[PDB]
Amino acid sequence: SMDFDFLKNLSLEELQMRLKALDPMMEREIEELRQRYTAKRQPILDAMDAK
Amino acid sequence: SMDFDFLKNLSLEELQMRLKALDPMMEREIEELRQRYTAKRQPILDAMDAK
């Protein structure tokens, strides 16, 4: 793949660092997702309150 | 919003159903994040293997 073609040009140490960064990056994305879902919830709550 | 104007129409029962559905929806999106980040590990590992 293109990603492999790019990554093969990096040092081993850089590749090790990139591998280790994935889990914390994913965890931050999950936190972002939770914040986006508060904004999905709110209009529904607002509509309930307007009935 | 046109979305809010839609939601205001809905019965309380319909709003409750939508609010409750957001939980499995968010969890499904967390599962997709897991898949996306595992995609990402593979080419890194492949580039490491190739040294």
Curated annotation (Swiss-Prot), chains A, B:
It comes from the Eukaryota. Residues 9-42 form a coiled coil. Residues 4-51 form the SARAH domain. The modification Phosphoserine is found at residue 11. This is Serine/threonine-protein kinase 3 20kDa subunit. The chain holds residues 436 to 484 of 491 of the full protein.
